[PDB]
Amino acid sequence: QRPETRFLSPEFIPPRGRTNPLKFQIERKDMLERRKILHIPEFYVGSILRVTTADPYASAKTSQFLGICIQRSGSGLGATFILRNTIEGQGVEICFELYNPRIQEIQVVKLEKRLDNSLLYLRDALPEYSTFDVNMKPITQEFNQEVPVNQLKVKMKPKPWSKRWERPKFNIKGIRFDLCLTEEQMREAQKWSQPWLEFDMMREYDTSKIEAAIWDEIEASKNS
RNA sequence: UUCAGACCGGAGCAAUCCAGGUCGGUUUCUAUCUAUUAUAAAUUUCUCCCAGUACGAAAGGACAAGAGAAAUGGGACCAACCU
Ligand SMILES: [Mg+2]
Ligand SMILES: [Mg+2]
Ligand SMILES: [Mg+2]
Ligand SMILES: [Mg+2]
Ligand SMILES: [Mg+2]
Ligand SMILES: [Mg+2]
Ligand SMILES: [Mg+2]
Ligand SMILES: [Mg+2]
Structure with a gap:
């Protein structure tokens, strides 16, 4: 079995602005x-x-x-x-x-996907989660073609936190909110929710035409 | 400060009073007329040198020239970061 999905490095995705496409080919x-x-x-x-x-x-x-x-x-x-x-x-x-010319070698020791697309909330999490062994050896991938999703709830220091993580705009599934919060505050956080946003249609960003074009551009660039 | 309330010295028999203290106390305008509504062509530090040299008995100790960095003030602009 060969599960095949192509991972495109996120910065080959051009922004929504009205910029002339000539810029992006450069x-x-x-x-x-x-x-x-x-x-x-x-x-x-x-x-x-x-x-x-x-x-x-x-x-x-x-x-x-x-x-x-x-x-x-x-x-x-x-x-x-x-x-x-x-x-x-x-x-x-x-x-x-x-892409900085000062960087010489990048090396992946552990390939992992944690539940949220950004964690700045590890700032207010307890010191364990931010600590790592400087000398740990690369732990390789078995080519399951499944990037392992590690679901790990985290503990946090007492409030205040650098940002308000409980609020809906952040969509944080990673934080453990039962131990860090009270029911009152979980009702408060629900007053800032904007339910209609997911249904906004027009706010959605369409890609796939561009995806095909630039992926074909990368094939064409590897060939030569 | 500067009205109406109120104490505390004092002065008056009192009412009240002292450019003596103390606490408290409404700040209104919808612009008719005149006026007015973006050109540019930098300023200042502090370093580094010179040269620890010129100057003085020594102790202390320069400008001028030349390379750098900043900061402020003009004019702009978002690749990144940050909102
Ligand atoms: Mg903060
Ligand atoms: Mg009296
Ligand atoms: Mg009052
Ligand atoms: Mg007063
Ligand atoms: Mg006024
Ligand atoms: Mg007028
Ligand atoms: Mg007015
Ligand atoms: Mg400026």
């Missing part, structure tokens, strides 16, 4: 020129990575970092992702540019 040709030197592996928010940077100021030019991918955003050449880790008890985040 960015694509550049970042696809970049793909051929530095190899960029798949990963998702929740997946654990280790990046090697060229560091001008250190003695060993290589700087090593390891953490969770908390969120990604961008498009074209300006793609970025954010790593999070606790070193010695200090919470540390880094923002990396995917």
Whole structure:
């Protein structure tokens, strides 16, 4: 059995603006020129990575970092992702540019999908979830063609949290809300819900034409 | 401060009073007329040097020239970040 679904790195998806499509073919040709030197592996928010940077100021030019991918955003050449880790008890985040020429090797130790598409809420979660072993070895993939969905509820510090996570606009399934909240506050949070949004139709973003076109563009670019 | 209430010194037999303190106390306008409603052509630090040299018995110790960084003020703009 060969389950086959093509994972397109999220920054090959052009934004909704009215920008002239000529711009996007340029960015694509550049970042696809970049793909051929530095190899960029798949990963998702929740997946654990280790990046090697060229560091001008250190003695060993290589700087090593390891953490969770908390969120990604961008498009074209300006793609970025954010790593999070606790070193010695200090919470540390880094923002990396995917296509930046300073980055030498990216390495995936654990490929994983956690329930929410961004976790900034690991800021208010207890220190365990942000801690990782600097030296852990890459734990490989069995080619199940199923990226494992780890459903893990989290514990949080007492309020306030850097954002209000209980409220509907965030759609957080990952947080454990029974232990961290009271019924009153769970009714409060329901006053900000906007039920009609999922049914808004016109607010929906259509892709697939573009998907076919640019995927064909990537095939065509690998061939040559 | 500056009215109406109120205490506390004091002054008056009192009513009341002292540019003496203290607490409290309504801030109204829908613009008729005149006036007016975006051109540009930078300013300042602090470093780095020079040169620890010129200057003085030593102790302390420069400008000028030349490379950098900022900050503020003009004019803009969202690839990223952040809202
Ligand atoms: Mg905050
Ligand atoms: Mg009296
Ligand atoms: Mg009052
Ligand atoms: Mg008063
Ligand atoms: Mg007034
Ligand atoms: Mg008029
Ligand atoms: Mg008016
Ligand atoms: Mg400015």
